[PDB]
Design a binder for this molecule. Structure first.
Ligand code: AKG
Ligand code: AKG
Lengths: 215, 217
C-alpha cells in the first residue's frame, strides 16, 4: 500500500471512483486489455475459468494493488484471459493505457511509484507459490490464512481477524483443494483453538507464533 | 519484443556495463544479503527459492532469458534484506545495477520506465501461470503443466516435439511442483511408458506439446 493513490487520483477534472457490488465482474476473459487498475477499497479475485465451468483463484488482491497488468504489454493488443471479480464491494480507479503511457513521460517520478507497485505484486504472487508448494494441506491452509491476516487483517484482543467473508469453496479455489477438505481442516484448526469463526470471518490467534513453523 | 529493449537499456546503463558470469550452481544472492541491485538475466536460467531452517529449498521461480529480477530492491533498496536465494541453474550471463543507478537512469531517460514496466508485468503473468500449475490437485497434471511451461521458456525444436534445454534432476523437479523426489521418479517413469516424453541425460523432450496442453482447457 502507498501514494499510488495520490498519483492515480490525478490522471483524469479528477478521476472518478468506479464502484462494483460484491460478485460483479470487473473484466471478463475475452475482453480487450486496454486499461490498468488501482484497487482502492475491497478485494478483487483474479481467476482462471476452464471449459468445465470450474474456476481457480490465481490472485486475491488487496487494497492499493495495481492490476490489469497485461495491458502494459505492448505492442500486442490482446485479450484478457483471467476473470476479475469484486470479491467484496469494491472501489477502484481505472485508466486507459495510452493515458498511463503519457503520464509516465511528463512525470518521470511516477514511473518509480508504478515499478514499486508491480514489484510488490511479483513478491506477493511468489508468497502464494510458497503456500501452494506445501504438501500438508493443513500447512497450506495456515499459510494462506497468515497471508490474509497480513493483507486484510484487523486487530483483535485474541489476534488478527480477517476482514473478509470467506466461504469454504472460496478457500478451496485459492489453495488447490476441495470444499469438503477445507471444512475438515478448518474444523481441526477450531478444535485446537488456533482460530475462531464468527459470521464467516476467521480470527487467528497468535499469528506471529503460528507463522514460526514456516522458517 | 520488450526483450530486445530490456537488453539494450541495460547494456547501455554504463563506462559501458559488463556482463557477469556465474558458473552453474553459484549463488547470485543469498537470503540476508542487502537488496541493492536489480538484475537482467541475459543467458541461462536463474532459480529463486525459499530456504527453511532444515536446509530444504522450495522453488518459487525458474527465470527465463530476458527476465528482470532482484525486484525487492525496487521497493526498499539496500534498506531491506533479500529473503530468497537466487542460484545459477545453468551457466548464467547477467547484467546487474545498483538501485540508485537505476532510479537515476529512469529520471534521465523518461521513456525507459515503459520497458521496465513491461518486464515486471511479464514477471507477474509468468508467476500467475505457475500458480495455475500448482493449483492442480493431482501430481501428474501438476508435472505435465510445469513441463509445458518449461517447453515455452527453455524449449528448442526436436523432430518429435520440444526439448527442454536444461538439465532437470528429479530433485529439482520435486522442489518446483511441491512433490517428493520419489513421486517425481515414478511420474516421469509413467510419462515415458505412455510415450509422452523421452529423457536423455536429464533433458526432457515432450512429444506434441500443443496437443497435450489441450487437456488443460
Ligand atoms: O495480475 C494482474 O494484474 C491481472 C492479470 C491481467 O492483467 C489480465 O488478465 O489482463
Ligand atoms: O522475483 C524477483 O525478482 C526476485 C525477488 C527479489 O527481488 C528478492 O528476493 O530480492
Amino acid at each position: 500500500e502507498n501514494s499510488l493513490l495520490t498519483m492515480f487520483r490525478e490522471l483524469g477534472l479528477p478521476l472518478q471512483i468506479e464502484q462494483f457490488e460484491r460478485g460483479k465482474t470487473i473484466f471478463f476473459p475475452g475482453d480487450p486489455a486496454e486499461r490498468v487498475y488501482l484497487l482502492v477499497k475491497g478485494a478483487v479475485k483474479l481467476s482462471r475459468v476452464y471449459e468445465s465451468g470450474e474456476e481457480i483463484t490465481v490472485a486475491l488482491l488487496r487494497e492499493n494493488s495495481v492490476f490489469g497488468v497485461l495491458s502494459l504489454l505492448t505492442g500486442q493488443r490482446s485479450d484478457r484471459f483471467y476473470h476479475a471479480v469484486a470479491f467484496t464491494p469494491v472501489q477502484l480507479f481505472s485508466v486507459p493505457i495510452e493515458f498511463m503511457q503519457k503520464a509516465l513521460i511528463e512525470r518521470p517520478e511516477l514511473a518509480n511509484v508504478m515499478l514499486q507497485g508491480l514489484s510488490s505484486r511479483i513478491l506477493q504472487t511468489e508468497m502464494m507459490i510458497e503456500t501452494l508448494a506445501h504438501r500438508d494441506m493443513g500447512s497450506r491452509l495456515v499459510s494462506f490464512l497468515l497471508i490474509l491476516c497480513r493483507d486484510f487483517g484487523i486487530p483483535s484482543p485474541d489476534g488478527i481477524t480477517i476482514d473478509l467473508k470467506l466461504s469454504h469453496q472460496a478457500i478451496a479455489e485459492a489453495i488447490g483443494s476441495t470444499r469438503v477438505t477445507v471444512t475438515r481442516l478448518l474444523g481441526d484448526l477450531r478444535e485446537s483453538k488456533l482460530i475462531a469463526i464468527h459470521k464467516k470471518r476467521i480470527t487467528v490467534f497468535n499469528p506471529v507464533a503460528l507463522s514460526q513453523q514456516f522458517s
